[PDB]
Design a protein around this nucleic acid. Structure first.
Lengths: 120, 209, 122, 114, 56
RNA sequence: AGGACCGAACCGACUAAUGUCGAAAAAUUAGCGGAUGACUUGUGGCUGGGGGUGAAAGGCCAAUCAAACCGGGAGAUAGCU
RNA sequence: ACACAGGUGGUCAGGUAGAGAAUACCAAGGCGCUUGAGAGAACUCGGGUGAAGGAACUAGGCAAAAUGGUGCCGUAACUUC
RNA sequence: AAUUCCUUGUCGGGUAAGUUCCGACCUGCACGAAUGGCGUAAUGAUGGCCAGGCUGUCUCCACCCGAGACUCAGUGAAAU
RNA sequence: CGAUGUCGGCUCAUCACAUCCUGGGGCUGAAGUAGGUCCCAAGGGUAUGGCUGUUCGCCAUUUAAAGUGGUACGCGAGCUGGGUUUAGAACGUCGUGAGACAGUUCGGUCCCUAUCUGCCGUGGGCGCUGGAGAACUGAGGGGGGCUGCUCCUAGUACGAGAGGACCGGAGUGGACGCAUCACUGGUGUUCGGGUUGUCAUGCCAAUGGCACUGCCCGGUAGCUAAAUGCGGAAGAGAUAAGUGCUGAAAGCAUCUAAGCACGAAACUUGCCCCGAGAUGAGUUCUCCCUGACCCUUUAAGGGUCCUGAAGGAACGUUGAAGACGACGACGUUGAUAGGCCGGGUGUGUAAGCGCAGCGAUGCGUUGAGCUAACCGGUACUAAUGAACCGUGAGGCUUAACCU
């Protein structure tokens, strides 16, 4: 009945979606913009955003938690050097959702999710 | 007597001196103000119409706005109507406080029940389940036979089946009032009232005794 | 909760080691007994030189439940291992002299005055 | 919300000593023997502490004359007077439920001593 | 499980009376370009509310 | 030493659930029995319809069996629909 | 009958733990099984956990649960020893 | 009794209560000696019964994770 | 007989009244208690087990009572398959024999995606006489209707005693129903920690994957019960059985023919809910529209241009609302959701570094570190300015008041 039970299932295993956003967050922080399905995008904000907040305080321990997630020395290197400074004041939402159209093969509502940057 | 509309804000308990733990429910009653009074000369029944809270100006529509305007009342969310009783005449603009419950003993709470959603036969009418095993195939929880054979040849109007359970008006009668805090406008009633945390609640004195 | 087919530990110097509640008494179609109810029990295991034996049918009164009872303040008193005290079938009058273990406050119902005046705790 | 918090605050007593799971605590509670307001003592080991502000409660376990008697206490009730501590214990677990099987010797715990 | 008598065109027709697809009914114009796009969606050229967010 | 024991491959098919216009004209999953022998299996021969074969159930003989299958007596006859 | 959860004999057979060609995780190498995207009702299917009670269920403890390994100590009636 | 209809025979044990089970009586409707009788250690995916253990089998179900069911897009049956 | 599937259990029912309890009366071989019997009464309630395939019944122990029956001896397009009517096998028995047996004994495939009728739920369209938003009356319909025990009345009336009330009142329970998470708890594969095997991040250290969440220990929010509150009524009307009052027919007598009064959980209300599709389409309040022209078989007509309001729908963020529609909140004149800040809660002394110890590891920094759905705040991102639907004062007849 899920009364006041936030969080989405997305038709996958528990194991699967945990590991799945791991891969997607990698993609996002390396490319700054991805053309994905909307419901995922809604849910992607609940992962990539805490990571940027967790990168606002550089240390050694924080790198570990930032590594305990996303499992990659390049993604963690993208954070703490680029996104740490680059935001440091955006006391809130770090990403923007832009509904685009419909995927041609299955009529799935696609959407763009990108960081509040790239105006360079 | 007259009813009084309020909002439901969680529930806690009140420890008395003796040590009895009385579970209460905090019904915050803002300030019910009279909007319209109906009479026999126009409607055939003496009743009042109240409102409460406040609504954003660009949300309340002109029909409703004009209505509140002739009563000199600040627009509130929703409207309710209470049946009067032979003689307790009010007037437009009259601000009914929460003071009217500072004497009564038992009240009756009436509100929209927490909607469980489309519930099955077990969850709704309390149908005892069937054997979970012993060969039972494809019918661990189903309702089973719902009628007789050829003779009735139909299903009686009233047969309990899987349907919408909840999200309807439910009245719990005779609930002891505990404390009537004047200042903070809180109405501590004993037990559990219906409705989700933050819905409307029609509170009125015990009709029976 | 004590119901039909339930092993209990006899809490008194009466002669029974372990008993089994055959039928909860007090009302029609009643699910289970509790705090200070009366249950018809049989004796499944007794001591050689006891005052009863294996196969007797006599009333009892539950004094300790694994589930625990609730005081009127929201306090629960959970024991460990169910327990009952044997009674005299015709008239309440508890059959033992001593009563091991503790008992609970709800035994103050006149027809059990004797029981609390013999129990060590509470 | 805000209003429900105020009704919780004005009831909550402010004089309860801090105690951790594993502390041999002696709790004194009232009892009514008809008309005698008697103060009954209760020794025991604190198994679990459940903190919820006004609704908080701690669980005490005492080995009586042969039956492990557990009991909880609605911390902020007028039925409870003292949470006097005896042995400051120390065990690496918030809830001590495994003490429902342990008996005698193997059922003891170490002291914190610092 | 099985039908008894074949349903007429009457029922077949009326059964399709609610499966009539609904048109879009609205196409907002672009603030800057003047193109057409659905409410809350981007345009063919990646403009949105007068902003080249896609830049592709 | 063993028609010995415990247990995979391999062979078998007892229980239950699913499936019973299925994924499949008898299977899957979870458990099961034998597993150095009267075992199991590859390749290639032998036997033949009132006959073959059978650790025997009237089981098996090309999804067909108390007499296979295909053609022919044959448009068998039909007090029956 | 199909791009079908089936059937088909022989050979090669690595690292860790293990008694092992069981099983768990990986290398070499090969694949994600030819519909997808959402919603997170009943109910069905395959599953995890459970207060107090423990066969009271029912045709019947069917199913589930549980026991499970190595080393040592210890082990009855009965018996063709 | 795999055999006994009358029959749940009568008696004893197990059970709070036992048409089944176990021991015995002989009135064997209608056992019986190689279409074998009575015993029997071992063995059985064998039948009947009892006991310990353990459990959602149940009293009485509650939640939760997944595959369908449900909605949108594509292809598109069947029995009658 | 070109198929109507049968026993019993399970599930779910439903009616009748020849009533098992509860309610109201008569009579008694009715002192009292407790009963025998008959009348009125169908609102509600009406066991758990052992045994057998059982129905039935016996037995154990309850309960206020463990009702009798109809409904394809209710119910297999809902279940089970034990029994009974398939093939295997055996004992006895009959037959020379194939085989047989309302003689018993082991083993033994239960199929069907719902078009229509019905039913439980929830919607789309149009109607309702100009359009729209709100709030109700209530025709009519459904739910609910059970009761023990203890105590007072009083150990009084009654009774030789033993025993032991009616009526009325108080408290506490069983069953059942409604509702809800504050408590005690269950779950809580999205939170935290312990740990075996292995692989990988170059390695140690630390973390991640996989093994039913790998196995386990706790656990927030929700949901839920075994948890906690609440409910059945009282009262009113008309009555049945019955009790009457007065009083003729019939000098009297007599409850009845006239007239009057009592009388039960049934009936109608009272309690709760659905409810104006109640086409008899109800009532009240508020809001908006008060522009010009041609054509015609000049009729509640058609058509053009110009204006398109109140409000709606649409789209978006979403909700303790939800299968989809609907319903509720919100759309920057903003707190709807996600984030973020602070707190709460949970778990339990992070990592790093230092010291002790040969080493595992301990101690300190440290009730830390991490924290889901929660509570209180903040626009940082996403809910865009507009477009779309719906109009332009609302027919005829009659009456009463104004003119």
């Amino acid at each position: 009945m899920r009364h006041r039970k936030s969080g989405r299932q997305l038709n996958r295993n528990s194991s699967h979606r945990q590991a799945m956003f791991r891969n997607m967050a990698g993609s996002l922080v390396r490319h700054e913009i991805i053309k994905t399905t909307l419901p995922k995008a809604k849910e992607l904000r609940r992962v990539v955003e805490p990571l940027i907040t967790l990168a606002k305080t550089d240390s050694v321990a924080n790198r570990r938690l930032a590594f305990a997630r996303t499992r990659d020395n390049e993604i963690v290197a993208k954070l703490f050097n680029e996104l740490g400074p680059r935001f440091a004041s955006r006391a809130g939402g770090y990403t923007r959702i832009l509904k685009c159209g419909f995927r041609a093969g299955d009529n799935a509502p696609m959407a763009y999710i990108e960081l509040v940057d790239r105006s360079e | 007597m007259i009813g009084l509309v309020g909002k439901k804000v969680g529930m806690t308990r009140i420890f008395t001196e003796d040590g009895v733990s009385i579970p209460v429910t905090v019904i915050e009653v803002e300030a019910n103000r009279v909007t319209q009074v109906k009479d026999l000369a126009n409607d055939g029944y003496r009743a009042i119409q109240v409102t409460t809270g406040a609504k954003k100006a660009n949300r309340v529509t002109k029909p409703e706005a004009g209505h509140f305007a002739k009563a000199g009342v600040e627009a509130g969310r929703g409207l309710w109507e209470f049946r009067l009783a032979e003689g307790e005449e009010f007037t437009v603009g009259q601000s009914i406080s929460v003071e009217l419950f500072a004497d009564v003993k038992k009240v009756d709470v009436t509100g929209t029940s927490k909607g469980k959603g489309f519930a099955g036969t077990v969850k709704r009418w309390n149908f005892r389940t069937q054997d979970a095993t012993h060969g039972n195939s494809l019918s661990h929880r189903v309702p089973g036979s719902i009628g007789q054979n050829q003779t009735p040849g139909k299903v009686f109007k009233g047969k309990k089946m899987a349907g919408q359970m909840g999200n309807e008006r439910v009245t719990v009668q005779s609930l002891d009032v505990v404390r009537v805090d004047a200042e903070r406008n809180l109405l501590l009633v004993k037990g559990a009232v219906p409705g989700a945390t933050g819905s409307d609640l029609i509170v009125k004195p015990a009709v029976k005794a | 909760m004590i119901q039909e087919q339930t092993m209990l530990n006899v809490a008194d110097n009466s002669g029974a080691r372990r008993v089994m509640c055959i039928k909860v008494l007090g009302g029609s179609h009643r699910r289970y007994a509790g705090v200070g109810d009366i249950i018809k029990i049989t004796i499944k295991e007794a001591i050689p030189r006891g005052k009863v034996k294996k196969g007797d049918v006599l009333k009892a009164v539950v004094v300790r439940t694994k589930k625990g009872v609730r005081r009127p303040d929201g306090s629960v008193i959970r024991f460990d291992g169910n327990a009952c005290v044997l009674l005299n079938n015709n008239s309440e009058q508890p059959i033992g002299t001593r009563i091991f273990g503790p008992v609970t406050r709800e035994l103050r119902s006149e027809k059990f005055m004797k029981i609390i005046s013999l129990a060590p705790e509470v | 919300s805000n209003i429900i918090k105020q009704l919780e605050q004005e009831q909550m007593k402010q004089d309860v000593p801090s105690f951790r799971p594993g502390d041999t605590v002696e709790v004194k509670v009232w009892v009514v023997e008809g008309s005698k307001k008697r103060l009954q003592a209760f020794e025991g080991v604190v198994i679990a502490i459940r903190n919820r502000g006004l609704h908080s409660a701690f669980t005490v376990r005492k080995i009586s004359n042969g039956e492990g008697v557990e009991r909880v206490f609605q911390t902020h009730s007028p039925v409870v007077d003292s949470i006097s501590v005896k042995r400051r214990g120390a065990v690496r677990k918030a809830k001590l439920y495994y003490l429902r099987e342990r008996t005698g010797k193997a059922a003891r715990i170490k002291e914190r001593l610092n | 499980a099985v039908q008894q008598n074949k349903p007429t065109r009457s029922k077949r027709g009326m059964r399709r009376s609610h499966d009539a697809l609904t048109a879009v009914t609205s196409l907002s114009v672009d603030k800057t370009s003047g193109e057409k796009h659905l409410r809350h969606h981007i345009t063919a050229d990646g403009y949105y509310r007068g902003r080249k967010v896609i830049a592709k």
